[PDB]
Amino acid sequence: LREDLKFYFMSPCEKYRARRQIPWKLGLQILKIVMVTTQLVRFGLSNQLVVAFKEDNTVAFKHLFLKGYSGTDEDDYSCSVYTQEDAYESIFFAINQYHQLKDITLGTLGYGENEDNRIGLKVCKQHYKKGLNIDNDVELDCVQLDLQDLSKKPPDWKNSSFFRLEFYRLLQVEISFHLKGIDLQTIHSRELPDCYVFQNTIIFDNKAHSGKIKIYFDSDAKIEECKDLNIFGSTQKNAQYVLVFDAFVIVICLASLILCTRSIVLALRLRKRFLNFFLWEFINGWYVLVIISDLMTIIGSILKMEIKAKNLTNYDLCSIFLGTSTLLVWVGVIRYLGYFQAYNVLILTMQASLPKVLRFCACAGMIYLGYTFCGWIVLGPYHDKFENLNTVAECLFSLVNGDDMFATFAQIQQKSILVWLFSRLYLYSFISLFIYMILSLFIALITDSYDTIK
Amino acid sequence: LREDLKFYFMSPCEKYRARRQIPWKLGLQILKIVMVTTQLVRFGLSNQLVVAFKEDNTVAFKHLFLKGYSGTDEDDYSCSVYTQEDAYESIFFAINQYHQLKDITLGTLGYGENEDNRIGLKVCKQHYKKGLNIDNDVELDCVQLDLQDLSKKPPDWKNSSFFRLEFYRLLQVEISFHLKGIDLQTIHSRELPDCYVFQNTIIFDNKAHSGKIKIYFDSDAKIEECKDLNIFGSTQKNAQYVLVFDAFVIVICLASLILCTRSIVLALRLRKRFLNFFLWEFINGWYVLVIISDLMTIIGSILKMEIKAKNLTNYDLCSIFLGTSTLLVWVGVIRYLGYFQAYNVLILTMQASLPKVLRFCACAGMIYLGYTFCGWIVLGPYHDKFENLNTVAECLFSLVNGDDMFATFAQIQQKSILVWLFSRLYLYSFISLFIYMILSLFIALITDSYDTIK
């Protein structure tokens, strides 16, 4: 039993130095680290290319169809108008741009079919029925504008009574159309280009009824088969090319999953044997982390394989899984390196101070929450950094860590002398209090780290 | 007496564990915390909606009536002109916009009556009477421009001699009108919309006589009864809906007010009994804080009820009261949590260091004040962060805490070599001195925290 206990606590390198036991587990771990990092890098590069293409196309569309587009979104919406003729001009400009799409576009862009396979432009409007007499119910009417209708020498659609919008009753006007684009940037690699279908919606939203309508542009994009295309170049097989690399990563992490599970079981067996002799110290906390990382890697690889198989363009859950898995993989490198045993005093303090810091954070947290609520309720309407609770929390965290305090002082509005005076008291007290609380903490931590060690 | 003293110092949880005394006071406190937080959140959301509507309407008005409005206020004033024809253009543009208000506005906006119930536009001008011969007295003359006068094919008002402004004598020109607006964004909730009355004043202020006039736009808004309105929807009763919740909050805090007062009296009775036996340690400093929070909550709730009853749109004192009350409520959570007694070393340092830090702040404060005065007097005309004493104080506080020093160095003007050289000496000495003073402080605090504990 004593021989087994010494062997289980022994480091693999010294296991080979004394017992000549080959540490295949360490090599498997290193291989897993390398494969996970390589897979993450490849996935990141591919996503970078696809996302860059889609965002560039969206920017080009915004420049083409939005009237007087500056080049930067004013907020969550691209642009806004404040006058009836301005809104009319924006709508008519968007419609007229779509008609000459061929003469204007600089890229490989063409007209796309709708759900019922028809090239055209659909515009819908919403109003409260008059029945300022109005009713809560809304009316929705849409008109389909084909390319033939827009091509007519007399536009006609413009003279239609459909466009007489009663802005006082208007809710929103939405313009939707489909476009097909091909990225020739990939043809150089002899890799057959992948056609894209863009579903664009322009929403002239005035739901607020505050005298200003907001123009939203959304461009949903997806990959489609390049039926209408003829290039001297090879097709794509890289799908199956990467399909084996992902499978190998799954197998390697699956092996590491069982291997760590078997080691935990053997540890439990030894503790039972030790307990019989003597009728937390046996469960490595670095094995459960490895198990979690393996599970996350397997899930992320499965999601990536599913995304690649179905030619999906959304990689948010898979990316999160892969990133967390890689982070956990690198903390295991810390574990292995620490085998040197020249890391002790630091580890000790990290265990001694953890309860004290956790107690301090619980106390400081209640002051922080109250300050958050007070700041949001008082400086909410007068400060841009205090508009909502989450923003208040982030601003207070930054202030606690020494960031952007002068901007916080400056961006207040002196239009209200009562609020301005309170803000100075609010900001000065908060910064002074948390500096002092962090002061009283370090000194205590130090005084106690001497009692425990000396 | 000894039994009573042990009971008064005993924690409520252990009181129930040993004496089986139900801690209804703790439950009442928790209930009060929950109600106060909920009330604050509801008030904040309602104020957010109302303030957002009013600010959006103000922005729309600024875009409509101010000529060549960029979209952002140049300062406390919205825009400014430097030429006589520019000022004439701005005034005439504002007047002409008001005439076609219906054809231009995108929201539910209509003309409003003035004090004497008349739809029109009033413009007033101020001049020093010539009597560069001029006098200190000013003359004020106003002309009322009805919609009929503006509707005339020949404007007329423009050809009037009233508009011949002698800019060399001009003080200001003010344009005032009334508008009525309805927010239909609330009709979806079946809640009858609340009509708004906007009092707008456009001031072309050239009081400085510095070759530049400043254009101010102010939009005072208030809620009015929707007489001219017909919507299939229910009226509002939420007034009385919230009127009971505020009353319950008042009752709960009123109960906590007497309960803490009774506890203090009982503590005083026990100290008198203790003093008779033995012919600060008895007044919880966490009871006076609770009493203050209760008073602030009661005052804020009364103010909120008054504001809701009279349909007022200004919530600055009530918001301050509620925020401070919530902050004080959350420090009581610290008090209760601290019952664990595993918080000691920190509390000790916080009492030992308080006199030392207060002494240090008194010394550092006198250097800080002198540096503030010197910076304001020297770098006042050459630095934007040193224009006035309050700004100097805020800038120096930020510099003491490591914020925006490079910007402070850069935003000086090298047009004066004497001031530029002084600023480098001023900034370098200030930062170095306060770093050293904070250095000499931490080391002292630490050396003494050992003498007191060890």
Next chain:
Amino acid sequence: LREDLKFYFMSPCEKYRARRQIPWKLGLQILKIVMVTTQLVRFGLSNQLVVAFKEDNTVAFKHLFLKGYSGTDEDDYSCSVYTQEDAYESIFFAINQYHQLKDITLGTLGYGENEDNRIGLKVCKQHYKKGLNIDNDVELDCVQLDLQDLSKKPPDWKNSSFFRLEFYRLLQVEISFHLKGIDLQTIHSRELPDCYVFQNTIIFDNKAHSGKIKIYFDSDAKIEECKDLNIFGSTQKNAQYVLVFDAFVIVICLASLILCTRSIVLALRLRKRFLNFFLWEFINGWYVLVIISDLMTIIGSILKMEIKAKNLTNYDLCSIFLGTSTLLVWVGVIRYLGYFQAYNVLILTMQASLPKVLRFCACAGMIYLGYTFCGWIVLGPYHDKFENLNTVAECLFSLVNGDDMFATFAQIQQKSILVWLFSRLYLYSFISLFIYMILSLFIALITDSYDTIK
């Protein structure tokens, strides 16, 4: 002798408590502090008003005379042009603005006479004589354009051969004129307004010969007697009103100068008497500071009196003197407050650590200088924060104190891979090294502060 020594070391408050000696010196010091602070505040407010008026007039002039002025100076120069017709347009626009000055200006502005008392416009140009054949010598020719010449229906001046500028030889074109302005903002206070004379020069400088000319606008302003003015209002006597307050400040500081000098002499007498008994500890270092502050205050008050007497508009040396004097006055408040004697441990560390910090700064300074030189020589042409040595020093100081490091990393140009790679090594090494050096310092300071006290 022992009685005298105890008396000289005794605090004034205890002197009155025991010997009943009235501390008139302390009262005189407090009075001096109050008077100095009040004088500084008054001077600052007056300078603020005058400077604000002059800067507003300069901004108005820039808007009036500079063609296409944005509202903010592009650098040390207001605007710039890159095309010959643009330069011609700017020059002609400036000249034409001056002609209609009356119809355009919004302030009380009129034409001013030149040195020889003549209303007109002088424009000078510089060229290298052709003698690309050219010579180092320059030619200067100027033409005077009176208001009569500009008023002519056919401008004429424009058709003159004087304006045929050979840009390839041009050095600069300068336009100078005089204007007279009155600030009526002061007439409200019944204080007679002070007339101003503006000397404006517009320089079209192309000295660099780099394809871009820089347009400089300078507006020298000075106060003149309001001969052409008639307002129902009183004249100014506040000159003599403040002339007594400054005289009283001089007398008070003169008294404090001799009083501290007499105290030092008495201290020297006591040390000589002490030395005879026993055949730095006697010279308060808080008396030489008071003497320096008194001298600075006297000099600043004399300069302020001279400036007020001669109606000067430049207050840079006097402001510096007054600010430094006020700063030194407030450090004496620290001295007096410290009489409490509860400040000891801090003072001790401040004396123990001073040699150690001075030694550390000498070492860190040599690394800092070398890093400054390397950064200026390498990242000089590729980084805006490393253009010149002073900017490099300020940037490195800010980096040492944790400020704007991410901006420092980002604002480099990747056009050169060699410089970009070096910058990462340069920035990473500098930040890491100085963090470690400050680390090794605090620990040493602390270890030694124990040896000296314990």
Next chain:
Amino acid sequence: LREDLKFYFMSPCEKYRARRQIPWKLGLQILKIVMVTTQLVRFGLSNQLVVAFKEDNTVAFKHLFLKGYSGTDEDDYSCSVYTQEDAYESIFFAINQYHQLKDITLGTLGYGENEDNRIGLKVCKQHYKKGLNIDNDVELDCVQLDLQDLSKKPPDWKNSSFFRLEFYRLLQVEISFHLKGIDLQTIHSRELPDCYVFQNTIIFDNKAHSGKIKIYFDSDAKIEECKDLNIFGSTQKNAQYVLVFDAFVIVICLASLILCTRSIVLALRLRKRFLNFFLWEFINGWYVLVIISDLMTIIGSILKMEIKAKNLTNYDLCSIFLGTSTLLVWVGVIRYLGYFQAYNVLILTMQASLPKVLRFCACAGMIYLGYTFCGWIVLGPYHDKFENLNTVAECLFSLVNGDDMFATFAQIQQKSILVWLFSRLYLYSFISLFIYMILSLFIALITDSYDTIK
């Protein structure tokens, strides 16, 4: 042997104080420091002048030839267009500007000859041959436009079929021309001006095929003999003027190279003699640094001499060498100053803490790398500070040092609720973890610095 050992450990000043040995080595070192610093300053000033001239000319060219140039590069490219007619307008505007170059330019600029000595304009275009039928191969065709062709009353070139660009197949359009410029700013110093030849290329690059073409402007400049120039002024000899100063610097550092090498050999001889008596402490680590600095200075001086001899305009390797040499020279000043021996406690900690900090950095580095990878993979497409791995590393380093955290929180896109929630967890955990790890480090360092010294 004991006498020799005491002499070798003895400081030069005390060597002269006792043995009267003149420290010519110290004087040689000081001379070397002075010469190196002077050479660096001179080189920096000359490079500043040349670089400023070239950059100003490039800015002028961008303003002249790029249509609608704002004044600041939108990125790595100067400007961009999104419409076919916009691209046509930009190309035609560039060509038309070149034709009237003389009437437009404000500087001494003239037409330059191409490789075959011909004044003209070359424009090349790239397309995939149609053979959306297209092929991977590209076609390149160029047309030479002489000044005579552009001068024709009927432009002609514009009506040519060459300009019919099929944007759907276009790769890029490049316009190249040569210009000759002279800087007359130097003629004042009587120093003959140096003529410059500018090779400018305008690239209308649409390689991305994303609906937006990017316009690149590159201006390669080099010095040429001023054949076409006649100024009354002297030629340049400063080449040989500085050629001796650089030679002297080389000789001085060459002498210091052998002198330090000889000292090391003598140290090795003494250690061998010491070893025979007793049958790291002898190799100054401040001699190898001096040797490295000498080698770097010699290499940099040789490179500078080569650059000056061949009139080259690129100074990036030489500048790096000189800067590193100067930095190493200033660390030797630290070495000499340290002879005072009042620097001990600091040096001690710097040796005691180095292993502990190196161990801590190895551990913190693995967490930092994992966080870098996770941030790049997750927040890559949604945050501008996480676009690529290097940017992620710089952002995380800045966050570790307290910089721009609030901006990091704010610049995320809430369009994805999953990514937004992860970012808050990602940022909060990273900042909290590294603060705690740095916390647990300082306390450990301090506890151990007591064990080693006390």
